[model samples]
Target: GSSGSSGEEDWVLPSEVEVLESIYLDELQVIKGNGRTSPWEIYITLHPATAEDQDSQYVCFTLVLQVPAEYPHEVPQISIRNPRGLSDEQIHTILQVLGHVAKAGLGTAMLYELIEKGKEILTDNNIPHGQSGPSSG
Candidate 1:
């Protein structure tokens, strides 16, 4: 079954932020900097699917999303922050994956997609820190 409206409509940043909060709950927060003209930012901390103890199982990272004024038309800039137990190379690849996902979903609400992609990236590569080496059986 299908729904109403056109393919893409104008999206309000605050409304989208509200939607994101409903989904992510306390994991998402808005960052208001010094000036009003500054781009709106959404700080999100993501964990792997089975995330529990950060000290033992799973990896986590903070995703800094800078929403453009023309959002749903222009992609939000994403930065990886506080990446715990994630390798630098993996971080680079995650950026690339997110960049592609954002561009691929252009002209539409994509912040959610970006978040899902980040989750996918982390989930796919969630190897324990010490076990990810060159050793083989």
Candidate 2:
């Protein structure tokens, strides 16, 4: 599973790393770095103002990275860790971001696409899983 390259250890491309870093630099955004290990965890937080009161609201999303010694050439496992408050609108936005990354970058594109597709399904069906859904009585 190892990439057989020395740099492959904790080796993410510079551009890919930049994309990962962007999430952290943006205001109201955060990211958790992963070391060379299995089951790397990526946490993201976005703070947006609520539509009604303009109050600051936070949404957290997590992606679990299951990198088997070898990566890039081989697809890595990506799964949701914390899926909360994901509204249809928000899911659409996230899918767009992921699509952009997939076309412009050299990281696990399939994984991103899969997540995006899942979001699309949830949004289409109006599955009230994310925070954007109306409160249940």
Candidate 3:
């Protein structure tokens, strides 16, 4: 007998973004991505499993996370932009896996996890075509 339009008392909080910057530091790029006065979208540029300060021989890409008002309750819209040394198929493959991640991550603060997984995938399959064989010597 109680469905009253789904109580709004559990709406997700916004300060989570603050935590993100504190965690990601220089790797994260914050943006609005639309006509919002507040910071609604954030871009995170990731490299294959390498130290934060060290350079990586593998590919890198920027992940755009668009935060909706219902964030955590609703999964953030994700897009891959500004890729370096990666093929089109590789990019789409990332999206395909992360798409499932977002679905399975419903109703939780999953940005950190998403970022980690994305980087993990890239690290596992990292190796740009042009830079093959004896480049490290």
Candidate 4:
């Protein structure tokens, strides 16, 4: 994971990978895999194109997970890859959407409930939890 700091390496955990994988696989359309060893790396690929656009304008979201050598209790370092031509706003939207999916609380109507509460949270704190920006629709 690339922290904002220079040359600072962070670690990731397997449990986090499992949680993310379960969330994405069960709730959304995405693909995931491991790409490295030692600190264990998991990569998630998300494409926003139809089968017709097999050659051009196919956007992909790649999430990199770096798990620590000794992990079970430690949190992993998760980072998303910026595909070509994606704006910062778009990336933020993707993160918020993923966060909302995770906060859905093990099925039930939690996604909707949390979305409503998230709206309230944004209204109060001026920070949107499941949307692009504080003032986004």
Give per-model TM-scores. Answer: 0.74, 0.38, 0.73, 0.38
Question: What are the lDDT figures for the candidates, one per model?
Answer: 0.76, 0.44, 0.72, 0.42
lDDT per residue (tens digit) for residues 1-137 in model 1:
44635555445666767777787778788865455345788878878877464455447889878887556566889889988778887898888889888888887777777888898888887875565664655
Query: Which 10-residue window in model 2 sums to the lowest lDDT?
Result: 39-48
* Residue-level error in angstroms, candidate 4, position 93: 1.1
Tens digit per residue, CA lDDT, model 3, 7-120:
564533345656877887778965553442233777898878655427544467888887776667567788889888777767888888876787798787777778888888
Question: What value of lDDT does candidate 4 attain over all alpha carbons?
Answer: 0.42
Ten-residue region with minimum lDDT total, candidate 4: 106-115
Q: Highest lDDT, which number?
A: 1
Q: Where does candidate 4 stray beyond 4 Å?
A: 1-40, 65-78, 105-137
Clash count of each predicted structure: 0, 4, 0, 4
Q: Which candidate is the best by TM-score?
A: 1
In candidate 3, list every pair of residues with a backbone clash.
none
